[PDB]
Design a protein around this nucleic acid. Structure first.
Ligand SMILES: [Zn+2]
Ligand SMILES: [Zn+2]
Ligand SMILES: [Zn+2]
Lengths: 60, 150, 109, 79, 97, 94, 60, 94, 109, 80, 98
DNA sequence: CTGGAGAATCCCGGTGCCGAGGCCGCTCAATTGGTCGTAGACAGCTCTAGCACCGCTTAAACGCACGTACGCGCTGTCCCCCGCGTTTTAACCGCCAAGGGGATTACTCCCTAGTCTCCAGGCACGTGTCAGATATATACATCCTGT
DNA sequence: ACAGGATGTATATATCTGACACGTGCCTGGAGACTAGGGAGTAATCCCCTTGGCGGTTAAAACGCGGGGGACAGCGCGTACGTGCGTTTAAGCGGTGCTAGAGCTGTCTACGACCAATTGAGCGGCCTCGGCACCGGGATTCTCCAG
């Protein structure tokens, strides 16, 4: 339960360490980096757009 | 067990086994786990009632980051399906999310069955028949339902 | 009296003019004949590129707390994206300026 | 005549500053105002040939844009 | 009184001019230079104001790019002061000489 | 009273489609027009040149496909091809 | 240890569900709103100053 | 059994006219053929671009001369336009 | 039985083919109409350029004391003349080699 | 056909450098020379294969290679 | 007594030798293997013309020779005679390839 | 700095070959001659914009003095590259075999050019209002020198 | 490292303003329907050249070792360039006036596309010999080390 709770929900492989400041959802950083550099600049959860400055490293 | 996409498909299969949504089912092809065969029941309160729709879905190793290719096997009469079974949906081309799984895909397809999207008239004939004549449209839908049982 | 006219751009789900692109292709002396789907494909590609640059420029303008896109915002958006920078590597944008960067050697320490 | 001196030392300094230069040696102003006039000659010659092919007496911004494009220096914002 | 050490005003100027977008050369001397250069191709040509502006945009962009390249050269030579050797090296590498 | 063509209207619609509440300067519109014309020239010239290589007299969607693959780099090319294919399929179906 | 890591370091009783936008430390809700209403725009971690627009809700 | 055209004959005649007692390798002839094709393509493209710029539908000798002036540098361009004018004058007189 | 056919190249006093140039211009899809003097002018220019390069290459071969022109001689002729070097600065010549030159710093002293 | 980049041997790279007029060569040059050559080949071969597959044939031709090179502003003479 | 040249003399001699000849400097068969390996990533089971492979090899050698001339100029500019990867990186960055 | 030894380079001569060069069908591409539709040359009117000038402000270029930070020369060191001999590897040449695929030709059919009609999207023209620049009084961060 | 003064620098508020986003008349170019013909898709067949394999030679690659030369760090000196301030200077802005030429329109004629018939010149093939690369041998020269 706790593992899945604190694991990134889109990949479910590794740990949450990033927040998208537009929608304030939390994902893991490299999912975010990949969706950006592959130009799907869109929130996986709430479908909100974001730029290079709307996501940052977080530590939980 | 080798790839994250394969493992994601493994959880997809186990969830479909343990708690499938209403009127849907799925299984891998025996010799190719990338191939997914699914059966969808027509939504209640819709002309698609009593339908047993066969589905085939093809995945690659970059799942869940990309929407897969989903194709109807039985003949279908839906404004948003091409004559071959090509499927044009929001989560399938435009607003795919890696959080979505095969169960979510099947539920979304069943939702489309009730609510065709007018922005994607893949079958122009079906779109027109839905748009101005519901009676013969649902007659056609009953025809495809009785045809899907075989 | 024939039928309600529908534009090809509307038929293809695009905002760019398919007919105008077709006219430019046929008048631009590129080839003797022009296919039916060629203007559709070209208009779609142009629309996608325009949308991409506009989206990045809007993000850049928002990052400066401005609501109007100017050539400076366009320049920032193009030069901050690697693929757009590669596509427009030999293009000068009037009144666009440059990206603010300083070599680490020059920085005081 | 003698208009190359209009490209002044402070103007060159601020161009270098935009380029990112910390300090500039004193022999660069003569070098750069020669480089500039070479570049200008190359562009203006093509622009004037375009104009005279068009049988005109005024050089137009579109002619200048064409001349720049002929050298792989496409410029946006003038037509 | 107050006195800034060399290198601080220069850094402030770099930050300032890398943020703004105006033309860094005075308009009339540049216009006279263009008219002077063009007069050896044909006599008493006329110019559009937009044409002169396009020329000035191109010239400033070219010079700024050249100065970035010459700064890279000077840094590569273990220096911080650019010198005409640096400009010549940049020009030769870019195939203009 | 000459009539001159530009892409201003379509650029404006695309802008309000992407950023619903963002404007654009007049000078930026000129740059967008120049960019659109430049990309159109590049792609059309490359497609015509391909048709000439293959001893063909008609520019169809295949040459535009290949020209986009040749010009646009990487992920841009991938997405542009995806968009063009979708538009052509939509146009043929309707 | 999971509950301890998931709990705020200010009170050590309540779940960490908010971050401070410029310094990016994660704390509780009422802990930061009480600090702000008491005028102490002050991080217990990095002492950073903040304003009314420098914090927002975040959900797991 | 397709037939392909080249400028080998004319290049050889020009060589015999310039150096009457000098030969040329087969591989050098390929380079000369590529060079001639390259220059032809350059000048033709530049002339077509001029014609489009001036809203003209015909490629005359004036466009060719202007394109030669644009491409060839300096004294080479002067001599080239001199030979072109001489040849066109002789042709019109004939 | 009209008249003895005089080639347009002979009329213009050129060795290069004028008819072939005209056919390539008309077939090359450069413009819908082609002037009468354009092929003549183009053929003259091509002939002059070919003559220039061939003369330089022959001089280079005679310098090396050979009687045939090879790609090495063509490359030497191209890279030695400043005008031709500028004209063909972005051209690779197969089996051409490079100009023999060594920077003065490297030489011992 | 795996790990063939090592076929571009150290003596071959030195010979190329000598033709370039290089007197002394550092020991680290070889790796980025391999990398630069690999980048150049990927750039050219991608376009060549694009031309080939557009022509609907399985054979890459010297003509396609010449076209790809010309598309990068480095036209090559002597191959048609 | 063994005879040894001073370090640099034979280097200059071989610069003179290779700046006079025109043969290909990379071994043809390994170059072809490398080309096929790289092309394997775009289309499987491709076939290559020998002339196409030769054209590739010629282009690459020309490109590398030009790059090395630029690198040598950069190294000399740095007041040294040995080329190091920073020189190659500077040359490629100035030419606009990176 | 001035001479021999040695290795590298240059010059001369005979030889064999294969690639350049001339010769012969012949077939298609260049030539010749009308024909006609129109694109471009040319005269004329206009009114837009480029050129020229004058006066006032003041922002900017100019010139001087100082000091200090950086360019440059000199020196030591040591390590990393080069020259070389020996051994190992695989490039290369020669030959042979199978066949995949490139290069033609025929046939047809469907897709695109061309034409006529029409009507609605987009363009020039007006117009008010809000995004942004500017002036001003702040709170705050940053450099510089003394500590 | 630390702290306070001085100077740019970020911040919030108020206000003008002029450029942009919306609305409207209208007009011309895009859409619809139709017809005609040829561009190309498809199938079939031929044979070229590409891939694959095998074996012998040997040239080039790999390894190792000794040495020395050049990259690099460090130090000292001097000069020239940044910084600041006082003094020109002319860029810039406004306002006005003039007219040259860009730009449009309307006429009209030479000129290039098109067609059909004719013929000769360039292409493919096919000999033929000499320019040149190569192997041997002699003469010359550059570089290094001892003097
Ligand atoms: Zn993740
Ligand atoms: Zn979200
Ligand atoms: Zn708390």
């Amino acid at each position: 339960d706790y593992k899945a709770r604190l694991t990134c929900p889109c990949c479910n492989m590794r740990k949450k360490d990033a927040v998208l400041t537009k929608c304030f959802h939390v994902f893991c950083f490299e999912c975010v980096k990949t969706r950006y550099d592959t130009r799907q600049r869109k929130c996986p959860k709430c479908n909100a757009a974001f730029g290079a400055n709307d996501f940052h490293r977080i530590y939980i | 067990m080798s790839t994250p996409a394969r493992r994601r498909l493994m959880r997809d299969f186990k969830r479909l086994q343990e708690d499938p949504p209403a009127g849907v089912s799925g299984a891998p092809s025996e010799n190719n786990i990338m191939v997914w065969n699914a059966v969808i029941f027509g939504p209640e309160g819709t002309p698609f009632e009593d339908g047993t729709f066969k589905l085939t879905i093809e995945f690659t190793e970059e799942y869940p980051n990309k929407p897969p290719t989903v194709r109807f096997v039985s003949k279908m009469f839906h404004p948003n399906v091409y004559a071959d079974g090509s499927i044009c949906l929001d989560i399938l081309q435009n607003r795919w999310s890696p959080t979505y799984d095969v169960s979510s895909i099947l539920t979304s397809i069943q939702s489309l069955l009730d609510e065709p999207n007018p922005n994607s008239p893949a079958n122009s004939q079906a779109a027109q028949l839905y748009q101005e004549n519901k009676r013969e449209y649902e007659k056609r839908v009953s025809a495809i339902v009785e045809q899907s049982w075989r | 009296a024939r039928a309600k006219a529908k534009t090809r751009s509307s038929r293809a789900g695009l905002q760019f003019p398919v007919g105008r692109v077709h006219r430019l292709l046929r008048k631009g002396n590129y080839s003797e004949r022009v296919g039916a789907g060629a203007p559709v494909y070209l208009a779609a590609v142009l629309e996608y590129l325009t949308a991409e640059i506009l989206e990045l420029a809007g993000n850049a303008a928002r990052d400066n707390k401005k609501t109007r896109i100017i050539p400076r915002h366009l320049q920032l958006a193009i030069r901050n994206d690697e693929e757009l920078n590669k596509l427009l590597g030999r293009v000068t944008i009037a009144q666009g300026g440059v990206l603010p960067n300083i070599q680490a050697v020059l920085l005081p320490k | 005549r003698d208009n190359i001196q209009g490209i002044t030392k402070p103007a060159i300094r601020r161009l270098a500053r935009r380029g990112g230069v910390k300090r500039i040696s004193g022999l660069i102003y003569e070098e750069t105002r020669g480089v500039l006039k070479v570049f200008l000659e190359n562009v203006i010659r093509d622009a004037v040939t375009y104009t005279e092919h068009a049988k005109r007496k005024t050089v137009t911004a579109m002619d200048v844009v064409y001349a720049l494009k002929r050298q792989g220096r496409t410029l946006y914002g003038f037509g | 009184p107050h006195r800034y050490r060399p290198g601080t005003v220069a850094l402030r100027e770099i930050r300032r001019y890398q943020k703004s977008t105006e033309l860094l050369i005075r308009k009339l001397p540049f216009q006279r230079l263009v008219r002077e250069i063009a007069q050896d191709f044909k006599t008493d040509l006329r110019f559009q104001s937009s044409a002169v502006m396009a020329l000035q945009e191109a010239c400033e962009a070219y010079l700024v790019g050249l100065f970035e390249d010459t700064n890279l050269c000077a840094i590569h030579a273990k220096r911080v002061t650019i010198m005409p050797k640096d400009i010549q090296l940049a020009r030769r590498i870019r195939g203009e000489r | 009273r000459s009539r001159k063509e530009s892409y201003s209207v379509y650029v404006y619609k695309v802008l309000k489609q992407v950023h619903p509440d963002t404007g654009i300067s007049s000078k930026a519109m000129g740059i967008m027009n120049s960019f659109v014309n430049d990309i159109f020239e590049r792609i059309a010239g490359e497609a015509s040149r391909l048709a000439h290589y293959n001893k063909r007299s008609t520019i169809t969607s295949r040459e535009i496909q290949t020209a986009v693959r040749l010009l646009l780099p990487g992920e841009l090319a991938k997405h542009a091809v995806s968009e063009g294919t979708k538009a052509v399929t939509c146009y043929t179906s309707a």
